[PDB]
Amino acid sequence: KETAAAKFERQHMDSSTSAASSSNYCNQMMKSRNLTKDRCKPVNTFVHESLADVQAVCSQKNVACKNGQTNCYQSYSTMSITDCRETGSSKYPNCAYKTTQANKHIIVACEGNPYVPVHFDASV
Ligand SMILES: Nc1ccn([C@H]2C[C@H](OP(=O)(O)OC[C@H]3O[C@@H](n4cnc5c(N)ncnc54)C[C@@H]3O)[C@@H](CO)O2)c(=O)n1
Description:
This protein is about 20% helix and about 35% strand. With about 120 residues, it is an alpha+beta fold. Strand 2 (about 60-65) and strand 3 (about 70-75) form a beta hairpin. The chain is globular and about 40 Å long. One of its GO terms (biological process) is defense response to Gram-positive bacterium.
């Protein structure tokens, strides 16, 4: 089945755009990337950087993840991200999100060999 590394690219990477261009970005991306297939995922962040720059975070500042694991890493630099959060009108299968564009450091969890991101922990 889909690997954790591939799932991270499908749910969190958007190298094709530098930022969200309209308030409908989240609604369109959450549906196209199949994140709303089974239910409305409540929160999801998309990163507008090259995949190589995001994979490189696995060799940057080590930090504990929110849940305590120690395989988390914080990017040294800020990155262009789009934060998607479910709105009060969201109702499966018509999942609805608020689009927020920002520049923040990202924290991801890394695993395997090659050592790559497999989970998005937070934006700070
Ligand atoms: N600002 C935010 C806040 C939350 N989120 C998303 C990221 C998460 O999904 P995902 O990246 O698939 O991660 C979940 C998967 O990762 C796995 N996982 C969790 N911690 C891990 C760790 N330390 N090492 C490896 N895998 C881990 C469990 C599961 O399969 C989800 C809940 O944390 O919400 C976000 O996009 N932006």
